[PDB]
Amino acid sequence: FKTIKSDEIFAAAQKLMPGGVSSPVRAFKSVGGQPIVFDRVKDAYAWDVDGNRYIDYVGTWGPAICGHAHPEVIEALKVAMEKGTSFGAPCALENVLAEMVNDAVPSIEMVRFVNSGTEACMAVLRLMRAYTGRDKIIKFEGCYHGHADMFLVKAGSGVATLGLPSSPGVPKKTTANTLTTPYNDLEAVKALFAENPGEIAGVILEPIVGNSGFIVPDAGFLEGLREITLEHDALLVFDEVMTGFRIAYGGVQEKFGVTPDLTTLGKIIGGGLPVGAYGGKREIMQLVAPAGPMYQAGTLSGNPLAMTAGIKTLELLRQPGTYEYLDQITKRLSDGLLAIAQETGHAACGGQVSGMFGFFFTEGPVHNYEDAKKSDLQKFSRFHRGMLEQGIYLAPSQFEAGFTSLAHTEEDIDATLAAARTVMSAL
Amino acid sequence: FKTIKSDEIFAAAQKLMPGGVSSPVRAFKSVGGQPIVFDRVKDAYAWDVDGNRYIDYVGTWGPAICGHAHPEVIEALKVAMEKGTSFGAPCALENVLAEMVNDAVPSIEMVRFVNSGTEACMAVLRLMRAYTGRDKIIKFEGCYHGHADMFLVKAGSGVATLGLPSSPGVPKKTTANTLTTPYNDLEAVKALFAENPGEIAGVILEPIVGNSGFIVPDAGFLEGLREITLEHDALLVFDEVMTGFRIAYGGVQEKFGVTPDLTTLGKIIGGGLPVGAYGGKREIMQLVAPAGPMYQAGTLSGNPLAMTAGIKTLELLRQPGTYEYLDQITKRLSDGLLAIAQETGHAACGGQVSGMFGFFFTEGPVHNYEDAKKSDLQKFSRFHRGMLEQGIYLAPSQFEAGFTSLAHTEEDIDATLAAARTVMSAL
Ligand SMILES: Cc1ncc(COP(=O)(O)O)c(CN)c1O
Ligand SMILES: Cc1ncc(COP(=O)(O)O)c(CN)c1O
Ligand SMILES: Nc1cccc(C(=O)O)c1
Numbered sequence: 001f002k003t004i005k006s007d008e009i010f011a012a013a014q015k016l017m018p019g020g021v022s023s024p025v026r027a028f029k030s031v032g033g034q035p036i037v038f039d040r041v042k043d044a045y046a047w048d049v050d051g052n053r054y055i056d057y058v059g060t061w062g063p064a065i066c067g068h069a070h071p072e073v074i075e076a077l078k079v080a081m082e083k084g085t086s087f088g089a090p091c092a093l094e095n096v097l098a099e100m101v102n103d104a105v106p107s108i109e110m111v112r113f114v115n116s117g118t119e120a121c122m123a124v125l126r127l128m129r130a131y132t133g134r135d136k137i138i139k140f141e142g143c144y145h146g147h148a149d150m151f152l153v154k155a156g157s158g159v160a161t162l163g164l165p166s167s168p169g170v171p172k173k174t175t176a177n178t179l180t181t182p183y184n185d186l187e188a189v190k191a192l193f194a195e196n197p198g199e200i201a202g203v204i205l206e207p208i209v210g211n212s213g214f215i216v217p218d219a220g221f222l223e224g225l226r227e228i229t230l231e232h233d234a235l236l237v238f239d240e241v242m243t244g245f246r247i248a249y250g251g252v253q254e255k256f257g258v259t260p261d262l263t264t265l266g267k268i269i270g271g272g273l274p275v276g277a278y279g280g281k282r283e284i285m286q287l288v289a290p291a292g293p294m295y296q297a298g299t300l301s302g303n304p305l306a307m308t309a310g311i312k313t314l315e316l317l318r319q320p321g322t323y324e325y326l327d328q329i330t331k332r333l334s335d336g337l338l339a340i341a342q343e344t345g346h347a348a349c350g351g352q353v354s355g356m357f358g359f360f361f362t363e364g365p366v367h368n369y370e371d372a373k374k375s376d377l378q379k380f381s382r383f384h385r386g387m388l389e390q391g392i393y394l395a396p397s398q399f400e401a402g403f404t405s406l407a408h409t410e411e412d413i414d415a416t417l418a419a420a421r422t423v424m425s426a427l
Numbered sequence: 428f429k430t431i432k433s434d435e436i437f438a439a440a441q442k443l444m445p446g447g448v449s450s451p452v453r454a455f456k457s458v459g460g461q462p463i464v465f466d467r468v469k470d471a472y473a474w475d476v477d478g479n480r481y482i483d484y485v486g487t488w489g490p491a492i493c494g495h496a497h498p499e500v501i502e503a504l505k506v507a508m509e510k511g512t513s514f515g516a517p518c519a520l521e522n523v524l525a526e527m528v529n530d531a532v533p534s535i536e537m538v539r540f541v542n543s544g545t546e547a548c549m550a551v552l553r554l555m556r557a558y559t560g561r562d563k564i565i566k567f568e569g570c571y572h573g574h575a576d577m578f579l580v581k582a583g584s585g586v587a588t589l590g591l592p593s594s595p596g597v598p599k600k601t602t603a604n605t606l607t608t609p610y611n612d613l614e615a616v617k618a619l620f621a622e623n624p625g626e627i628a629g630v631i632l633e634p635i636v637g638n639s640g641f642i643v644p645d646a647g648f649l650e651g652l653r654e655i656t657l658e659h660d661a662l663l664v665f666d667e668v669m670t671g672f673r674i675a676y677g678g679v680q681e682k683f684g685v686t687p688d689l690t691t692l693g694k695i696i697g698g699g700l701p702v703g704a705y706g707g708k709r710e711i712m713q714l715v716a717p718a719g720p721m722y723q724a725g726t727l728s729g730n731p732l733a734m735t736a737g738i739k740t741l742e743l744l745r746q747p748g749t750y751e752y753l754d755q756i757t758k759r760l761s762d763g764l765l766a767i768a769q770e771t772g773h774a775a776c777g778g779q780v781s782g783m784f785g786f787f788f789t790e791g792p793v794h795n796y797e798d799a800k801k802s803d804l805q806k807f808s809r810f811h812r813g814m815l816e817q818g819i820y821l822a823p824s825q826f827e828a829g830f831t832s833l834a835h836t837e838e839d840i841d842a843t844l845a846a847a848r849t850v851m852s853a854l
Contacts, residue, residue, distance in 0.1 A: 009519055016525040018718035022540045022729030026517055027717040040510035048518065060515035061726050069511045077512075078505060084468035084496045085504075085699035085736070088487035090453055091465050092436055093474060098443040113449045113702045116542045116727065122549075126576065128595020135598050147723050149553060149576065149601075158716060158724055168720045169557030171604050174576075254849060271780050272512040274542045274701035274727040287446035288584065290454040295595040297574045297584055299488045299694065300543065300701045302449035309512075 001389040006037040007047040007391065010307045024158035025061075026323060031187060031396040032381045038387075041068040046393055054393040055412050059223060061395075062242055062267035065326075065355060066316050067407025073271055073312045080308040081416075086300060093307035100314050101269070101277065105250050107238075107259050111279035112288055113302050117241035117266030118146030120276035123296050124262050128235050129353065130294045131284050134201040138192060140183045142212030143320035144371030145239045145264075153178045156211035161397040183368045184218045189225070201403055202235030204260075207252030210401035212240045213356040213372040214350060214358020235284075241266035241276070242401070245317060247354050255353075268317075269354075271309025274300075322406065326355035329413055330404045333357065336417040344424040346379070355404040379427060386423035392416055428816045432476040433464040451585040457804070458811045458823040468495035470834040473820055480821035482839050486830040489669055489694035491781065493743045494834025498674045500698050500739045501792070507735040513727060520734035527741055528696070528704065532677050533686045534665070538706030539715055544668035544693030547705040549725050550574030551691055555606075555662045556628045557721050558711050563627040565619055567610040569639030569796035569826075570632050572666045572691075576601040583638020587796065588824040609795045610636060611644065613651045620659055629662030629688070634679035637669045637828030640799045641778060641785025649685045662711075668693035668703070673830070674781045675750060682780075698736030701727070749833065753782035756840050757831045760784070763844035770852040773806070782831035799826060806854055813853065817846030 015021030021027050028035045037049040044067055046056045055234070059065070066073065098111045114120050125148060129135060137150065144157035149170040158164075167175065179196070181188040183205075193200055203225055209215035229236045238260045240251045245268040248255040253263065262280035269275050279285060289295045300306075316322075334352040337359050341348035349364030350357060360366060361376040361383070380398045387394055395402060441447030448454050448462070455462040464476040471494060473481045483495070493500065521540065529535050540633055543546050545740045552575075554849070556562055564577065571583030579604045580593035593602055606623065608615040610632070620627060630652060637641040656663045665687040671678040672695045689707030696702055706712065714721045727733075743749075761779040764786050768775040776791035777784060787793055788803040788810070814821055822829055 009522060010517065013517060013522050013525075015541055016522060016537065018537060018712050018715040021517055021717065022521055023721065023724040024716040025724060026515070029717050035517055037519060038514045041514060042511060046514075046516075058515050060513040063513055063726075069509065074508050074512075077508060081501055081504060082496070083466070085501075086487040086490055087465040087468060087473070088453075088485050089465045089473075090440065090448060090462055094449060095436065095440055098440075102443065110445060111443065112445050116546070118546060118549075118724065118725065119543065122575070123596075129598065130596045130801070135600065148549065152722060155456060158720055162717055164716065164720055164722065165577065167506060167557075167722070168714070169553035169555075171556065171562040173562070173600050173604060176602065177598070184536075184721070270513075270727065273732070285445050289591070290446035290448065290451040290456055290589070291593070292445070295451065295574060295579060295582075295585055295591050297452070297571075298450040298543070298545070299490075300697075303699070303701070306701065314821055360766070 001052070002050050003036065007034060009037045009049060010034050014159050024162060025397065028144050028396045030161050031379070031384050043067045044405055044412050052391070054391050055416060057402045057404070058393055058395050059405055060272070062403060063270055063272050064403070065246060065268050065405055066313060067405045072316065073309055076308055076312045077305060081305060083304065085305050086297045086303040088299065091302070093304055093305050093311065094302045097225050097307050097311050100311065101279065104314065105263060106254055107261065107263050108279040109282045110278055110285035112285070114276040114298055115301055116276040117264065118148060118279040120211045120241065120264040120266060121145040121151065122148040124237060124264055124278045127262065127284065127287060127294060128201045128237065130287050132201040132233070132235060134199050136177045136179055136196060136199045137180045137201055138181060138189065138203040140205050141180050142183060142372065143209065144211040145204060149174055150178050154180045156399060160212055160399045182370070183215060184221055186221060188226045189228060193228065200232065200234050202237055203229055204237040204239060206243065207240060208243050208247060208353060210356065211399060212369040213360055213366055213399050214356065214401040215366055215368070216351065216353060218367060219357060222256060226258050235262060236260040237262045239264050243356070244268060246356055248323060249317060261278065268313065270306055271311050271313035273306040275306045275310055323354055324353055325406060326404060329410065330355050330357050333404065333416060334359070334411050337420055340417065340420050340424055346424060346427065357402050357404070360398060382427060383423055387419060390419035390422060428479070429477055430461070430463060433462065435466045436476060437462050445683050452588060452824060455823050458591050458808045470494050470496070471832055471839055479818065481818050482843060483820045484829040485820060485822050485830055487699060489673065489830060490697065490699045492673055492695055492832055493740055494832045497743070499743065500736055503735055503739045504732060507731055510731065512732050513730045518731055520593050520731050522730040524734045524737050527738065528706065532690060533559065533680050533827070534688065534690050535706035536709040537712040538704050541703045541705065541725050542701050542727055544691060545573030545575060546725065547691040547693060547703040548578065548666065549575050551664055551689055551705045552577060552631070554711065554714060554721060555664060555689065557714055559628045559662065561626050561628045562604040563606060564604060565606040565608065565616065565627060565630045567608055567632050569610055569799065570666070571638040572631055572635055577605055580605060581607060583636065587639040588826045593638045603844050609797070610642065611648055613648060616652065617655060620655065627659065627661050629664055630656055630667060631664040632668065634658055634665050635670050635674065635780060636669065637783060638826065639796050640787055640793055640826045641783060641828040642793055642799070643778065643780060645794060649683060653685050662689065663687040665690045667691060671695065672744060673783055676744060695740060696737050697733050698740040700733045700736050702733045702737060750781055752833060753831050756835055756837065757784055760840045760843060764847055767844065767847045773851060784829050787825065809854055810850065813850035814846055817850055819843050819846045
């Protein structure tokens, strides 16, 4: 297994960008060693700069639900770009996408496009405050909602993977309005409310966690959150940037039946291009400029290319059998990966919901971040390298959810299991 | 001059999105309130959803310097999209793009790509505060540095256009670690520093403002700023998101010989695709994850399509007589406008540096925001609507700089001055 090309390129990159990467998660810093420079990606596969081919389970971290380089998405983008990549003015495409999103998502009645998850979460942060007139916010421990200053407290994603403290650069003055708490812990929430009357604007959370491993809400936990926030005139916000259009057409809020007041979207909505969105109840959105006082600008927000990619992407998920297939194939992978773990003598656990899954090297179960932190990070490290040299690409972290697409085949699954068997037999 | 389709389309939009747009300035609120919807852009022109052709001076807010729909930029993108549009792992393109940017801009010894100028603006503040260990930041009235919390106070763009105030979702707890001074007031700055010892991280500003109208730095303004920050061990940061590559290849810092410690880029570097970047001295960039403790990530960061359109744009700008041609046409146009005003009895003033200019309905001269606010916005509103009917497209705000391209011909410059005359002979 040669990685000479990925090696030279990565070495050069370190003298050019901080740690040779455009993002901390692309760093194999915890998973032992150096990364893989990709060359191209198509369907469920990816080819590095040395020729090795892999079956992808990362999918550019989420957008790829239809599979890489999807023919219908890439031709629609071909024709579209003949008209120019950006206007800086309205274009009918915005209406078409805005319309689709309102339909797709239950809570959403009025939308605002933006350029990424980080901008959507940051905008919804502000809006929460402006709308309620309150300063404090309740975010759970291990969750990630971008790197907006106030969210840089007890974050997951790369902060966990890298083992970093909270912040460095965000004033104490602002971090103080961020009240934290263990995921799945309803009692902690209540205690925070009764102890800070008239100050809590809302609760924000990953309806199903993906940045501290994969974690599902406890039975009743979401409903409880709808129930208590209503009682204190507080806002319930679901960061569905990563679960949006993946867990279900309308997301966790549609699947599990609970409707928030504001939701954020990203990833899959771009179709592979930079796109984010935030929206919800009409009366809350009215506070956004140029309709209301809360200002939020964007030179490239709503550009035609991003709009096109997303439109097409959504038209495909809308076809029959979409979410069934995703469930079907991801169940086999999860069950099989667990089946093998037992059969080879290793403590393990995880599960899946539609096209998203997780698998930890511990007995479990995992209900929160602290539980997640008990995984044998040393074992996962040797298991990753193993899965690698066998042609399977996984999130270089024990703290990320794995993804599955409509391009993955029953055969791709089996080939994965087979390699998982081979790898675990040593360890 | 019919705008039927643009009207029904914008009308429908207001039901779907806040204000019916994606960035505030597109609502046309300052110039009558009735926007036109684009269908396509090419070379130096734009086209309505009604069939009208305009000569563009907005150029998508900066990015289209080489002209709309550049043949070489789009063919290049059509070639790269067959290899997928988003990887999630490193790619050779980031290295080549990075290397080019380090070469181009003085201050930059190490860069980090992001998805927007806003993101880069969030980031540089946090980095500057983290590096020094101080929380006070100094900013100027009318300078836009991304719709973020800490900076939504007397900002530019929509703010310095439709009179947007301070805060819009940002508490007194955010906009309190930030100080303010009138752009161009060296004394106020020395004051602020003396008035606040050992607690100012640095100064961030637009080297040339385009967000409060086009405004150039006075005599030894920048030179002064560098010398004072140096003395206090404070950082000098240049938001060159607008100026970079448009004023000069190395932006304003290269043009006026002053070198800041860090700088932010955006717009042009992505060739009309969601992109941004921030870089500066090595020793400081080290603190950025994963190389350092300060967190900042981005899913779509450093993607291939954006890196591809960035490189083709920088290649075209590196050709012979690039910035020469812009200075040449932008002067003929800037002067042409100012001449027609003197001859039609309308007081006005303006100016240009390379392919960027300004034109204010007042005798000026404009040295700051207050100065900018003595403009006759009723005349502008009317003036603007006039030009729109002659087929010339201008920034729908008196506080927004105009832009020129390498596709604008001498003849397009002549015909605008023609409209400029037929129109100014009214009002
Ligand atoms: C739940 C969630 N929200 C937001 C983000 C960050 O948004 P983006 O990277 O699109 O800026 C991520 C990134 N993996 C995420 O998973
Ligand atoms: C100087 C400056 N800084 C930051 C920004 C933010 O730009 P973007 O739309 O890329 O987030 C702008 C946008 N007009 C700008 O003019
Ligand atoms: N999940 C996640 C979070 C942040 C960045 C990335 C990335 O690929 O650059 C992915």
